[PDB]
Design a binder for this molecule. Structure first.
Ligand code: HEM
Length: 213
């Protein structure tokens, strides 16, 4: 079975559970507010920072290299623009770093530093979602919070180097299928993707509790 398919099948159940996290339900209904949005986006800033440090560490390693798309996909510089927008000029000392965000970042460095053959699972789980549900969430955010169509504060959701997310996702899947694949790597990559999804769910469960505490 192709890696792209194995991953879709392996993660289709937990995707359902992730898209119905309470935080995401509230978000999708349009009950997202500045405070909650700031929290989630600050947490993503740390997550993508760690993911992309690890992509850079492993960019020439053939277990990852065919998925190396910094110009199209990487989110850190976008997140920095967003953090300056939502948190101001001293955002770096303002932004929170939650325990569930730390947990995710920790696993990211373990994968990038020790199990780089699994790094694809983590790039898959975040980037392809950003090009899918992330586009729906962006429209909702804009409406709920009165964000301007010019993009300020939602640079994370904006991919100026990708003309067509659907066609890009297709390119990316096909490229995943060119990685060197053995049953051991395939098994473990799809397991790590389920883990990635759980790390995301845990983040959201946490952020939701913080907002109701
Ligand atoms: C409200 C929340 C969400 C909605 C409405 C949503 C919606 C979608 C939709 C409609 C697709 C299909 C795209 C396609 O076939 O090209 C998709 C794919 C994806 N989503 Fe989400 N999603 C949400 C949350 C999540 C979260 C939290 C993650 C990960 C943490 C995520 C990760 C993915 C991945 C990795 C894919 C691609 C699956 C594949 O094609 O193999 N999504 N999502």
């Amino acid at each position: 079975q192709d890696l792209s398919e194995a991953l879709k099948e392996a993660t289709k159940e937990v995707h359902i559970r992730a898209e119905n996290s309470e935080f995401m339900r509230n978000f999708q209904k349009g009950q997202v507010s500045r405070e909650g949005f700031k929290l989630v986006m600050a947490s993503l800033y740390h997550i993508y920072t760690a993911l992309e440090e690890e992509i850079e560490r492993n960019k020439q390693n053939p277990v990852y290299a065919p998925l190396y798309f910094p110009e199209e996909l990487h989110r850190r510089a976008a997140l920095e623009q967003d953090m300056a927008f939502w948190y101001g000029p001293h955002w770096q000392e303002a932004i929170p770093y939650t325990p569930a965000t730390q947990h995710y970042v920790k696993r990211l460095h373990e994968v990038g530093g020790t199990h780089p053959e699994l790094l694809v699972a983590h790039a898959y789980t975040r980037y392809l979602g950003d090009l899918s549900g992330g586009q729906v969430l962006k429209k909702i955010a804009q409406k709920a919070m009165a964000l301007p169509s010019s993009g300020e504060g939602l640079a994370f959701f904006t991919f100026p180097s990708i003309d067509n997310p659907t066609k890009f996702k297709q390119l990316y899947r096909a490229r995943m299928n060119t990685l060197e694949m053995t049953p051991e790597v395939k098994h473990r990559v799809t397991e790590e993707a389920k883990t990635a999804f759980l790390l995301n769910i845990e983040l959201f469960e946490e952020l939701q509790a913080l907002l109701t505490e």
